[PDB]
Structure 1
């Protein structure tokens, strides 16, 4: 009954090992309880059935200043009733069979680990036995002993999962099995670009993120601002974000808070308006449905009035820091650090400044009830040569009554539940377990939430029209010089998420909010934008484009290690190809007949170590090849 935690002390070398457990119950005040050294060398602790969901911290029991050591430093390792886990010498937190007396095979790499190498050398081990067997992707069972290796992913096409089952029998005669899953990832090169003249100092975020993906700069089209999405399509996305990267996810337990999760920004223009579609996600339904408010439409962004901004760069030469200027009735000049801040019932610090060049802020609000919504122009130079947003010349775009939704000067905004994208990509790691930078690691636990129960109605959309005559531009300007744009989401003051995504949205995500340390300091800190804006209409003139080359993702549908006579499907995928792609599959250099398809079925006759390959050629003669190992 209960749960068990084991600790490998062979590297830490602590005289006494303590374990501190918190969550459903606290085992004891820090430093916790003494673990028991076993003759295996491992240290062991047990927790009763009452300790249903715990976070575990190991430590040497010593005080600050007298040699205190602990691991992890903040967020404990997850352990639930019914589990038996071990912290290895390499500091992997792994399943170690189950909390009973049976034998089990286990891996020294944590279950559900993703990897981008061609294989992952996963070491195998046995608990309460000394021989086991393994089956990988349905292979015949093959014996193994402690220390042996399995090349997980060997031979396989990228973006496939690998199943690995370990079999053992203990002294009690009970045959057990432990099934593991690993993901071999593949990431195609993406065409990306930037220009020095915009003052940006951080490269556009990539991976799942993208600024002007596939060189999409928006489209010339008339949009109907009405909350219906049939007038948009995926080709019009100028900034691709990800789901579940809003700051709350980096706190130990902040999934109860309303998300501010930007997903994608689309743009179009005609001769009258500049148009935008903003998609926001709410994955709480899937990640933490126990948090009733956040996993419900009580989380809709128009529940309360929260500032939202479209930062635009019309004149590319101007740099506006965010500072604002105005005049008093007596002619005296004043400045504020941001156009809106500690303003009318927001009594919190925070804002978003700009290094990347902008000169215009469309300052609006999430339920379109702020009669002060305005287009601010950075039309006044400060002493340092930067420009300040001018209260005196702002263009009012606010409603006269919330009920009426009658925005001034032709500004149009509609919001609704809905989702335009048919994929919602983000990280689905357990709550509390997120780490800094993990949104840029392709081996984090990325999912398409539509494969995990997401529904269109979970998300939120805003459709917006900004009249060109409020921006000092026309369609010719957009199509010939272009402009830049970024959407900013707040939770009142400071930024929380942006499109394009900027790392200042997360640089302090794991720090405590002044008024409530359960939630994120990102709600109140000072952010500063350093990535490129998304271009609309045309690239900046000094843009350097980094073109992704033609490339192939190739391999088997089954892990290396299959039995003779098993049909193995060799698959090939192409990226950045021109025209038709022809694929030539080979095994030890000998061709396999594939028709003119992207797949071939190879049935190995005899044992051996085969070199499987593909050569791909497109209609402009670009060539890509891949060669992999497959063992029978």
Structure 2
């Protein structure tokens, strides 16, 4: 009955260990209640079954300015009724058997840990027993004792799961098992590129992010601005983002808020229009369905009128900071820090500025009801050589009336539910656990949400046509000189998400919104774009292109440690190859079409490998250890 928390105090050295529980209930006023030092040396605390969902903070009880220590420093660690966990000397929150008197094998690495090394050394331990057994990827049971280790992932191909079951028997004779899952990740290098002349100071984000992936610069094609996506395909994506990286996810409990989650930007052009498709995701259905509003079509972006922006670079030399300029009826010049800000209903601070070069701002709104929608040009130079967006020359694209959807000067916009991508990658960690930077870490808990129940109707799409004559260009300019684009999303003023993604969208994501500390400050702060725009039509002249090399991801389908006579499938996949790839598998250097089966007869430690050669003689090799 209830739950248990254990604390390893061997490194902290606190004289008294306190535990503070908050969630379904609060055990006591901070610093909390005193944990019990056991014979194990561990400190233990127990919570009744009413404490159904809690977060745990360990501290030494002393006050600020008198030697206060605590862990974690911010949110607590998750503990639900029925669970039993321990904070290790290495500060890992790990399962520790169950809250009973049985024996259990456990790992000193947290369950479901991802890793990109060739193996993860997991230490094993026993609760209420002194001998156990383990099986890895269904291997024969093997003895183990406290301190022993298992090379999780060793010998395996990358991007694969590992299953590890620990068996234990206590003094009550109950045999128990604990099954653990780990993922070995593999990340191929991607061809990236950047040009100094655009004034960018932050590299384009990679991993799951990508700017102009595979040198996709959009495609020449007439697009039908309806709500239908049959005229687009993946090859036209110019900026790939990720799902569930919008600011709200970094708050302790902000999944009730409407998402602003940009997933992907596509572009095309003909002789009349520049075209865009924009994908937005809504993974609340999967992450937090208890939040009814957010995990519903009530969170569709056109529910209200929210500003959106396509920022373009037409003349590449011009650098517009976002500042805006205009003239009164009496001729006097005025300036604003952004084209829109505290404007009409919006009484909120915030905005997005630009270090990367832009000179044009397509300023529209999320339900296409703002009659003031405009295309601004930075056509007026400031004293510092920067350019300012001009109210006096703005091209109006707004509707005359919301019901007519009759935008001026040729601007077309249609929005709808839907999803063009067939995969929706994003981190699916428990609410409140998100950490700054985890969108750049390949060992975060990444999932394809289509494998967790995502549906096409969950997401949202916008299809947009901007007439070339409203940008001062033609098709030939796009295809020989090229331009840059970025989609910005807001929640009223400040940016929230961009494609290409910019880190200033999340540099303050965990700070508190001034009007409601449960929601993110990113709604109201000042963003500053420093990544490269996505190119359309052609590359900037001084572009340095980093070509990813031809490489291979190789390994076994079962973890090292199988039994003799077990068939072991060796697998290989290649990346960035030219034409036909020829694989050549070996065991101890002895050769054994993209895979092959190897049955070892005798025990021992083997070297498995593959050499891969493509049609231009490019070679890639991998060699790994497999033990039986």
Query: Structure 2 length normalisation: TM-score?
Result: 1.00
Distance 1:361 1:2 in 2: 57
Distance 2:29 2:269 in 1: 61
Q: What secondary structure sits across from 1:615 in the alignment?
A: strand
Instruction: Report the equivalent of 1:246.
Output: 246
* Offset of residue 61 of structure 1: 0.2
What do the CA deviations read for 1:96-130 (whole angstroms, capped 9, x no partner)?
A: 00000000000000000000000000000000000
Distance 2:111 2:611 in 1: 34
Q: What secondary structure sits across from 1:50 in the alignment?
A: coil
Q: What secondary structure sits across from 2:248 in the alignment?
A: helix
Q: What secondary structure sits across from 1:393 in the alignment?
A: coil
What do the CA deviations read for 1:209-263 (whole angstroms, capped 9, x no partner)?
A: 0000000000000000001000000000000000000000000000000000000
Distance 2:398 2:74 in 1: 45
* Offset of residue 450 of structure 1: 0.3
Distance 1:562 1:456 in 2: 42
* Offset of residue 7 of structure 1: 0.1
* Offset of residue 303 of structure 1: 0.2
Distance 1:264 1:244 in 2: 13
Distance 2:265 2:92 in 1: 38
* Offset of residue 459 of structure 1: 0.0
Instruction: Report the equivalent of 2:163.
Output: 163
Distance 2:564 2:373 in 1: 70
Distance 1:112 1:342 in 2: 45
* Offset of residue 458 of structure 1: 0.2
What do the CA deviations read for 1:294-342 (whole angstroms, capped 9, x no partner)?
A: 0000000000000000000000000000000000000010000000000
> What RMSD in Å do the two structures reach over aligned CA positions?
0.3
* Offset of residue 384 of structure 1: 0.5
Distance 2:327 2:303 in 1: 34
Distance 1:562 1:569 in 2: 12
* Offset of residue 451 of structure 1: 0.5
Instruction: Report the equivalent of 1:273.
Output: 273
* Offset of residue 401 of structure 1: 0.3
Distance 2:267 2:29 in 1: 55
Instruction: Report the equivalent of 2:618.
Output: 622
What do the CA deviations read for 1:146-170 (whole angstroms, capped 9, x no partner)?
A: 0000000000000000000000000
Distance 2:77 2:155 in 1: 33
Q: What secondary structure sits across from 2:602 in the alignment?
A: coil
* Offset of residue 274 of structure 1: 0.1
Distance 2:51 2:485 in 1: 50
* Offset of residue 422 of structure 1: 0.2
Distance 2:398 2:32 in 1: 57
* Offset of residue 201 of structure 1: 0.1
Q: What secondary structure sits across from 2:302 in the alignment?
A: coil
* Offset of residue 187 of structure 1: 0.1
Distance 2:105 2:573 in 1: 35
Q: What secondary structure sits across from 2:303 in the alignment?
A: coil
What do the CA deviations read for 1:501-552 (whole angstroms, capped 9, x no partner)?
A: 0000000000000000000000000000000000000000000000000000
Distance 1:344 1:22 in 2: 41
* Count of residues in Structure 1 that have an aligned counterpart in Structure 2: 628
* Offset of residue 488 of structure 1: 0.1
Distance 1:280 1:78 in 2: 30
Distance 1:128 1:385 in 2: 73
Distance 2:130 2:486 in 1: 59
* Offset of residue 178 of structure 1: 0.2
Instruction: Report the equivalent of 1:354.
Output: 354
* Offset of residue 179 of structure 1: 0.2
Q: What secondary structure sits across from 2:6 in the alignment?
A: strand
Distance 1:34 1:227 in 2: 60
* Offset of residue 430 of structure 1: 0.3
Q: What secondary structure sits across from 2:463 in the alignment?
A: strand
Q: What secondary structure sits across from 2:197 in the alignment?
A: helix
Distance 2:86 2:434 in 1: 20
* Offset of residue 441 of structure 1: 0.3
Q: What secondary structure sits across from 1:178 in the alignment?
A: strand
* Offset of residue 69 of structure 1: 0.3
Distance 2:603 2:522 in 1: 58
* Offset of residue 492 of structure 1: 0.2
Instruction: Report the equivalent of 2:467.
Output: 467
* Offset of residue 81 of structure 1: 0.3
Matched, 1:612 2:612: no
Distance 1:531 1:56 in 2: 38
Distance 1:579 1:347 in 2: 58
* Offset of residue 53 of structure 1: 0.4
* Offset of residue 591 of structure 1: 0.5
Distance 2:585 2:334 in 1: 71
Distance 2:426 2:181 in 1: 19
> Unaligned 5+ residue runs, structure 2?
none
Q: What secondary structure sits across from 2:223 in the alignment?
A: coil
Query: Structure 1 length normalisation: TM-score?
Result: 0.99
Instruction: Report the equivalent of 1:34.
Output: 34
* Offset of residue 618 of structure 1: 0.1
* Offset of residue 473 of structure 1: 0.2
Instruction: Report the equivalent of 2:458.
Output: 458
Q: What secondary structure sits across from 2:584 in the alignment?
A: strand
Distance 2:97 2:39 in 1: 18
* Offset of residue 608 of structure 1: 0.7
Distance 2:464 2:116 in 1: 40
> Unaligned 5+ residue runs, structure 1?
none
Q: What secondary structure sits across from 1:275 in the alignment?
A: strand
What do the CA deviations read for 1:592-619 (whole angstroms, capped 9, x no partner)?
A: 0xxxx10000011010100000000000
Distance 1:28 1:329 in 2: 65
